[PDB]
Symmetry: C2
Subunit: 91 residues, 2 copies
């Protein structure tokens, strides 16, 4: 899924994201929770536990989880459409 | 300095960047070297050892150095002007 998000009619994105790995080092950045308020709740397509692959062409597959947050924060301060590429995970 | 870089007439940016901290944890992301070839050599304003504060509004003050590289890589693949905010360091 690509979920292109409005932002003009909404203002906040409304997700926490989280890092998750096994002891082998495999994992990535996931949708933590979706706030009852924001763009992502409103679009409805993304779910908790889905993997975040990309945001406006910035890849998140190997992002540190503290960078992921501050980088999504910065992108959310850029005015305009926010394009999430997402792997649907089924919980 | 803000150095807004052409990219249409150049193609590659032409810097390596590096992380650097003292034992107290203070430091950041720096210009590693400037390639004799790219946009940054051509613009001429930035120097090795200068600190990278921001790139197209993505803050680099706390970026991990492996994220910094892959994030600058991604931004450099977005077509268009690349805006570097930079602290001049004097070597």
């Amino acid at each position: 899924m690509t979920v292109t998000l409005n932002m003009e009619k909404y203002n906040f994105l409304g997700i926490s994201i989280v890092g998750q790995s096994n002891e082998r080092g495999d994992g990535g950045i996931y949708i933590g929770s979706i706030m009852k308020g924001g763009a992502v709740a409103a679009d409805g397509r993304i779910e908790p536990g889905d993997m975040l692959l990309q945001v406006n062409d910035i890849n998140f597959e190997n992002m540190s989880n503290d960078d992921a947050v501050r980088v999504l924060r910065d992108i959310v301060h850029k005015p305009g459409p926010i394009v999430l590429t997402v792997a649907k995970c089924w919980d």
